[PDB]
Amino acid sequence: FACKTASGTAIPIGAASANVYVNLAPAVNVGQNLVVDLSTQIFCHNDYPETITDYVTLQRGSAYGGVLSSFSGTVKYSGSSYPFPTTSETPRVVYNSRTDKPWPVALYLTPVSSAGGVAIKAGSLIAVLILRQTNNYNSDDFQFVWNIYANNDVVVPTGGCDVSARDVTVTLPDYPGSVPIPLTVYCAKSQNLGYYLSGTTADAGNSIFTNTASFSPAQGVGVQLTRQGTIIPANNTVSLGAVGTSAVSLGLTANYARTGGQVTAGNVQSIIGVTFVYQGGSSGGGADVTITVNGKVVAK
Numbered sequence: 001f002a003c004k005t006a007s008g009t010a011i012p013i014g015a016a017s018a019n020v021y022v023n024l025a026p027a028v029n030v031g032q033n034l035v036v037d038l039s040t041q042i043f044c045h046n047d048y049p050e051t052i053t054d055y056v057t058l059q060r061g062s063a064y065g066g067v068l069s070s071f072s073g074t075v076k077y078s079g080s081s082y083p084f085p086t087t088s089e090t091p092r093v094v095y096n097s098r099t100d101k102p103w104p105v106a107l108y109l110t111p112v113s114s115a116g117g118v119a120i121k122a123g124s125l126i127a128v129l130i131l132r133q134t135n136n137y138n139s140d141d142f143q144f145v146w147n148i149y150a151n152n153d154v155v156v157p158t159g160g161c162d163v164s165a166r167d168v169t170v171t172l173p174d175y176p177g178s179v180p181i182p183l184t185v186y187c188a189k190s191q192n193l194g195y196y197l198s199g200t201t202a203d204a205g206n207s208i209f210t211n212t213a214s215f216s217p218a219q220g221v222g223v224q225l226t227r228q229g230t231i232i233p234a235n236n237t238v239s240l241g242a243v244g245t246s247a248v249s250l251g252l253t254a255n256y257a258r259t260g261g262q263v264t265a266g267n268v269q270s271i272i273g274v275t276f277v278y279q280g281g282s283s284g285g286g287a288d289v290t291i292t293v294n295g296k297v298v299a300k
Protein backbone atom coordinates (compact mmCIF):
# COMPACT_ATOMS: atom_id res chain seq x y z
CA PHE A 1 0.00 0.00 0.00
CA ALA A 2 1.91 3.04 -1.29
CA CYS A 3 0.31 6.48 -1.59
CA LYS A 4 1.02 9.96 -2.94
CA THR A 5 -0.76 13.33 -2.99
CA ALA A 6 -2.06 15.21 -6.08
CA SER A 7 1.04 17.49 -5.77
CA GLY A 8 3.31 14.41 -6.18
CA THR A 9 4.39 14.17 -2.51
CA ALA A 10 4.83 10.53 -1.37
CA ILE A 11 3.14 9.53 1.89
CA PRO A 12 5.63 7.63 4.09
CA ILE A 13 4.97 3.90 3.58
CA GLY A 14 4.60 1.98 6.85
CA ALA A 15 5.01 5.04 9.11
CA ALA A 16 2.84 5.08 12.31
CA SER A 17 2.04 8.80 11.73
CA ALA A 18 2.17 11.03 8.61
CA ASN A 19 1.32 14.69 7.83
CA VAL A 20 -0.57 14.85 4.51
CA TYR A 21 -0.92 18.28 2.85
CA VAL A 22 -3.96 18.56 0.66
CA ASN A 23 -6.03 21.20 -1.23
CA LEU A 24 -9.70 21.61 -0.15
CA ALA A 25 -12.67 23.04 -2.05
CA PRO A 26 -15.53 23.23 0.46
CA ALA A 27 -19.08 23.66 -0.80
CA VAL A 28 -22.69 23.64 0.34
CA ASN A 29 -24.65 20.59 -0.89
CA VAL A 30 -28.24 19.43 -0.16
CA GLY A 31 -28.41 18.12 3.44
CA GLN A 32 -24.64 18.34 4.10
CA ASN A 33 -21.60 20.34 3.10
CA LEU A 34 -18.38 19.07 1.51
CA VAL A 35 -15.25 19.92 3.57
CA VAL A 36 -12.67 18.04 1.50
CA ASP A 37 -12.92 15.40 -1.23
CA LEU A 38 -9.73 13.35 -0.60
CA SER A 39 -10.35 11.19 -3.73
CA THR A 40 -8.92 14.03 -5.88
CA GLN A 41 -5.96 14.48 -3.39
CA ILE A 42 -4.68 11.01 -2.42
CA PHE A 43 -3.78 8.15 -4.85
CA CYS A 44 -2.70 4.65 -3.77
CA HIS A 45 -1.47 1.34 -5.30
CA ASN A 46 0.00 -2.09 -4.34
CA ASP A 47 3.69 -2.43 -5.36
CA TYR A 48 3.65 -6.27 -5.07
CA PRO A 49 0.17 -7.57 -6.08
CA GLU A 50 1.40 -11.06 -7.07
CA THR A 51 2.73 -11.80 -3.56
CA ILE A 52 0.23 -9.80 -1.43
CA THR A 53 -3.26 -8.24 -1.55
CA ASP A 54 -3.67 -5.12 0.66
CA TYR A 55 -6.82 -4.16 2.54
CA VAL A 56 -7.28 -0.71 4.14
CA THR A 57 -10.12 0.47 6.44
CA LEU A 58 -10.88 3.79 8.23
CA GLN A 59 -11.00 3.19 12.00
CA ARG A 60 -13.23 4.38 14.84
CA GLY A 61 -12.08 7.69 16.37
CA SER A 62 -11.26 9.33 12.97
CA ALA A 63 -12.37 12.98 13.40
CA TYR A 64 -11.89 16.66 12.33
CA GLY A 65 -8.99 18.47 13.94
CA GLY A 66 -8.43 22.04 15.04
CA VAL A 67 -11.13 24.61 14.28
CA LEU A 68 -13.44 21.90 12.85
CA SER A 69 -13.27 19.53 15.90
CA SER A 70 -16.62 20.67 17.43
CA PHE A 71 -18.60 19.98 14.20
CA SER A 72 -20.23 16.66 13.39
CA GLY A 73 -20.71 15.36 9.84
CA THR A 74 -20.26 12.29 7.71
CA VAL A 75 -17.46 10.53 5.85
CA LYS A 76 -18.12 8.85 2.47
CA TYR A 77 -15.74 5.86 2.40
CA SER A 78 -15.80 3.73 -0.80
CA GLY A 79 -19.41 4.58 -1.59
CA SER A 80 -20.79 4.20 1.95
CA SER A 81 -21.68 7.15 4.19
CA TYR A 82 -20.95 6.99 7.96
CA PRO A 83 -21.20 9.35 10.96
CA PHE A 84 -18.00 11.42 11.44
CA PRO A 85 -16.32 11.30 13.99
CA THR A 86 -16.35 7.59 13.18
CA THR A 87 -18.11 5.21 15.60
CA SER A 88 -18.39 2.24 13.19
CA GLU A 89 -15.96 0.07 11.28
CA THR A 90 -15.71 0.66 7.50
CA PRO A 91 -15.50 -1.92 4.70
CA ARG A 92 -12.05 -2.68 3.29
CA VAL A 93 -10.67 -0.98 0.18
CA VAL A 94 -8.69 -3.61 -1.76
CA TYR A 95 -5.36 -2.72 -3.38
CA ASN A 96 -4.54 -5.58 -5.82
CA SER A 97 -2.77 -3.68 -8.61
CA ARG A 98 0.18 -1.37 -9.39
CA THR A 99 -2.20 1.12 -11.12
CA ASP A 100 -2.86 4.22 -8.98
CA LYS A 101 -6.37 4.48 -7.64
CA PRO A 102 -7.88 7.42 -5.67
CA TRP A 103 -8.32 6.88 -1.90
CA PRO A 104 -12.17 6.96 -2.03
CA VAL A 105 -12.81 9.31 0.88
CA ALA A 106 -14.77 12.56 1.27
CA LEU A 107 -15.40 14.46 4.52
CA TYR A 108 -18.72 16.30 5.09
CA LEU A 109 -20.13 18.68 7.72
CA THR A 110 -23.74 18.65 9.02
CA PRO A 111 -25.36 22.09 8.48
CA VAL A 112 -26.10 23.95 11.76
CA SER A 113 -26.48 27.59 10.53
CA SER A 114 -28.09 29.43 7.53
CA ALA A 115 -24.98 30.86 5.80
CA GLY A 116 -22.19 30.60 8.38
CA GLY A 117 -18.55 29.98 7.57
CA VAL A 118 -15.43 28.75 9.38
CA ALA A 119 -12.07 30.04 8.10
CA ILE A 120 -9.34 27.44 7.61
CA LYS A 121 -5.80 28.87 7.20
CA ALA A 122 -3.17 27.16 5.05
CA GLY A 123 -1.01 24.78 7.13
CA SER A 124 -3.75 24.18 9.69
CA LEU A 125 -4.90 20.65 10.73
CA ILE A 126 -8.30 19.69 9.38
CA ALA A 127 -8.57 15.95 10.25
CA VAL A 128 -6.89 13.03 12.03
CA LEU A 129 -7.75 9.82 10.19
CA ILE A 130 -6.95 6.39 11.66
CA LEU A 131 -6.27 3.64 9.11
CA ARG A 132 -5.80 -0.12 9.53
CA GLN A 133 -3.92 -2.20 6.96
CA THR A 134 -4.36 -6.00 6.63
CA ASN A 135 -3.59 -8.66 3.95
CA ASN A 136 -4.93 -11.96 2.47
CA TYR A 137 -2.22 -14.45 3.66
CA ASN A 138 -1.60 -13.90 7.40
CA SER A 139 -3.04 -12.10 10.50
CA ASP A 140 -0.47 -9.24 10.47
CA ASP A 141 -2.01 -5.77 10.73
CA PHE A 142 -0.83 -2.21 11.04
CA GLN A 143 -2.73 0.74 12.54
CA PHE A 144 -1.50 4.21 11.56
CA VAL A 145 -2.61 7.84 11.41
CA TRP A 146 -2.87 10.37 8.57
CA ASN A 147 -3.01 13.98 9.83
CA ILE A 148 -4.72 15.93 7.03
CA TYR A 149 -3.38 19.51 6.68
CA ALA A 150 -4.74 22.33 4.52
CA ASN A 151 -2.53 23.45 1.63
CA ASN A 152 -4.78 26.53 1.07
CA ASP A 153 -6.83 29.24 2.78
CA VAL A 154 -10.50 28.32 2.62
CA VAL A 155 -13.88 29.01 4.24
CA VAL A 156 -15.86 25.91 5.15
CA PRO A 157 -19.63 26.63 4.97
CA THR A 158 -21.69 25.55 8.01
CA GLY A 159 -25.19 26.23 6.67
CA GLY A 160 -27.46 25.60 3.70
CA CYS A 161 -26.43 28.81 1.91
CA ASP A 162 -23.19 30.47 0.78
CA VAL A 163 -22.14 34.06 -0.07
CA SER A 164 -20.22 35.76 -2.90
CA ALA A 165 -17.67 37.08 -0.35
CA ARG A 166 -17.20 37.02 3.43
CA ASP A 167 -15.59 40.54 3.48
CA VAL A 168 -16.59 43.37 1.13
CA THR A 169 -15.12 46.92 1.10
CA VAL A 170 -16.85 49.76 -0.77
CA THR A 171 -15.82 53.39 -1.32
CA LEU A 172 -18.55 55.99 -1.29
CA PRO A 173 -18.13 59.02 -3.61
CA ASP A 174 -17.28 62.24 -1.65
CA TYR A 175 -20.18 63.40 0.57
CA PRO A 176 -23.01 63.28 -0.35
CA GLY A 177 -23.37 60.12 -2.44
CA SER A 178 -24.07 56.43 -2.65
CA VAL A 179 -22.38 53.21 -3.84
CA PRO A 180 -23.83 49.72 -4.53
CA ILE A 181 -22.56 46.89 -2.31
CA PRO A 182 -21.75 43.81 -4.41
CA LEU A 183 -23.03 40.92 -2.29
CA THR A 184 -25.08 37.86 -3.30
CA VAL A 185 -26.22 34.64 -1.62
CA TYR A 186 -27.33 31.21 -2.95
CA CYS A 187 -28.61 28.03 -1.23
CA ALA A 188 -28.06 24.30 -2.08
CA LYS A 189 -31.90 24.00 -2.23
CA SER A 190 -34.69 26.65 -2.01
CA GLN A 191 -34.72 28.35 1.42
CA ASN A 192 -36.96 31.16 2.72
CA LEU A 193 -33.96 33.32 3.51
CA GLY A 194 -33.52 36.58 5.32
CA TYR A 195 -30.71 38.64 6.80
CA TYR A 196 -30.07 41.36 9.36
CA LEU A 197 -27.39 44.04 9.81
CA SER A 198 -25.31 44.52 12.94
CA GLY A 199 -22.90 47.10 14.23
CA THR A 200 -22.86 50.34 16.19
CA THR A 201 -25.49 52.95 15.38
CA ALA A 202 -25.52 56.60 16.34
CA ASP A 203 -29.22 57.50 15.90
CA ALA A 204 -32.49 56.93 17.76
CA GLY A 205 -33.74 55.18 14.57
CA ASN A 206 -30.94 52.52 14.80
CA SER A 207 -30.31 52.95 11.02
CA ILE A 208 -27.13 55.10 10.82
CA PHE A 209 -23.91 53.30 11.60
CA THR A 210 -21.44 55.45 13.60
CA ASN A 211 -18.38 56.85 11.93
CA THR A 212 -15.49 54.90 13.52
CA ALA A 213 -12.67 56.32 11.31
CA SER A 214 -9.65 56.89 13.64
CA PHE A 215 -7.67 59.41 11.60
CA SER A 216 -8.92 62.96 10.77
CA PRO A 217 -12.59 61.87 10.68
CA ALA A 218 -15.65 63.85 9.77
CA GLN A 219 -18.18 64.83 12.47
CA GLY A 220 -21.98 64.77 12.18
CA VAL A 221 -22.23 61.90 9.67
CA GLY A 222 -22.57 58.12 9.56
CA VAL A 223 -23.30 55.33 7.04
CA GLN A 224 -26.81 54.18 6.15
CA LEU A 225 -27.71 51.14 4.06
CA THR A 226 -30.62 51.16 1.62
CA ARG A 227 -32.37 48.75 -0.75
CA GLN A 228 -33.62 50.87 -3.68
CA GLY A 229 -34.04 53.89 -1.38
CA THR A 230 -35.77 51.85 1.36
CA ILE A 231 -33.83 52.28 4.66
CA ILE A 232 -32.50 49.15 6.39
CA PRO A 233 -32.14 49.56 10.18
CA ALA A 234 -29.78 47.36 12.21
CA ASN A 235 -31.13 44.21 13.93
CA ASN A 236 -34.14 43.93 11.60
CA THR A 237 -34.62 40.86 9.43
CA VAL A 238 -35.03 41.66 5.73
CA SER A 239 -36.65 38.86 3.71
CA LEU A 240 -35.05 37.87 0.38
CA GLY A 241 -37.94 35.50 -0.51
CA ALA A 242 -37.09 32.02 -1.71
CA VAL A 243 -33.35 31.70 -2.46
CA GLY A 244 -32.25 28.66 -4.48
CA THR A 245 -29.15 27.59 -6.42
CA SER A 246 -29.13 30.82 -8.50
CA ALA A 247 -27.40 33.72 -6.68
CA VAL A 248 -29.68 36.47 -5.34
CA SER A 249 -28.32 39.95 -4.68
CA LEU A 250 -29.07 41.46 -1.26
CA GLY A 251 -29.65 44.73 -3.27
CA LEU A 252 -27.75 46.83 -0.71
CA THR A 253 -26.41 50.37 -1.30
CA ALA A 254 -24.25 52.43 1.12
CA ASN A 255 -24.99 56.15 1.71
CA TYR A 256 -23.99 58.90 4.16
CA ALA A 257 -26.65 60.05 6.67
CA ARG A 258 -26.61 62.98 9.14
CA THR A 259 -26.47 62.35 12.90
CA GLY A 260 -26.87 65.95 14.14
CA GLY A 261 -25.18 69.28 13.66
CA GLN A 262 -22.87 70.39 10.88
CA VAL A 263 -21.23 67.70 8.73
CA THR A 264 -17.51 68.57 8.93
CA ALA A 265 -14.56 67.58 6.65
CA GLY A 266 -12.77 64.27 7.08
CA ASN A 267 -12.75 60.48 6.80
CA VAL A 268 -15.81 58.29 7.26
CA GLN A 269 -15.73 54.58 8.07
CA SER A 270 -18.37 52.08 9.25
CA ILE A 271 -17.91 48.26 9.67
CA ILE A 272 -21.29 46.51 9.28
CA GLY A 273 -22.05 42.81 9.76
CA VAL A 274 -24.59 40.77 7.75
CA THR A 275 -26.09 37.60 9.30
CA PHE A 276 -28.41 35.25 7.41
CA VAL A 277 -31.43 33.54 9.01
CA TYR A 278 -34.08 31.08 7.73
CA GLN A 279 -37.75 32.23 8.07
CA GLY A 280 -38.73 31.73 11.73
CA GLY A 281 -35.17 30.68 12.63
CA SER A 282 -32.91 31.87 15.45
CA SER A 283 -30.27 34.60 15.09
CA GLY A 284 -27.35 32.33 16.10
CA GLY A 285 -23.63 32.98 15.60
CA GLY A 286 -21.74 36.08 14.54
CA ALA A 287 -21.77 37.98 11.26
CA ASP A 288 -21.61 35.94 8.07
CA VAL A 289 -20.27 38.90 6.02
CA THR A 290 -18.36 42.04 7.07
CA ILE A 291 -18.90 45.19 4.98
CA THR A 292 -16.42 48.06 5.35
CA VAL A 293 -17.77 51.33 4.01
CA ASN A 294 -15.23 54.10 3.45
CA GLY A 295 -16.12 57.68 2.63
CA LYS A 296 -14.92 61.26 2.89
CA VAL A 297 -16.43 64.70 3.55
CA VAL A 298 -14.42 67.32 1.59
CA ALA A 299 -14.41 70.97 2.72
CA LYS A 300 -15.43 73.47 0.01
Ligand SMILES: *[C@@H]1O[C@H](CO)[C@@H](O)[C@H](O)[C@H]1NC(C)=O
Nearest residue numbers: 196198199206234235236283
Ligand atom coordinates in the same frame (compact mmCIF):
# COMPACT_ATOMS: atom_id res chain seq x y z
C1 LIG B 1 -32.23 42.58 18.33
O1 LIG B 1 -33.63 42.29 18.40
C2 LIG B 1 -33.96 41.18 19.26
C3 LIG B 1 -35.47 41.02 19.18
O2 LIG B 1 -36.15 42.10 19.81
C4 LIG B 1 -33.46 41.43 20.68
O3 LIG B 1 -33.66 40.26 21.47
C5 LIG B 1 -31.98 41.81 20.69
O4 LIG B 1 -31.56 42.15 22.01
C6 LIG B 1 -31.72 42.96 19.72
N1 LIG B 1 -30.31 43.31 19.69
C7 LIG B 1 -29.89 44.58 19.71
C8 LIG B 1 -28.40 44.78 19.65
O5 LIG B 1 -30.67 45.53 19.76
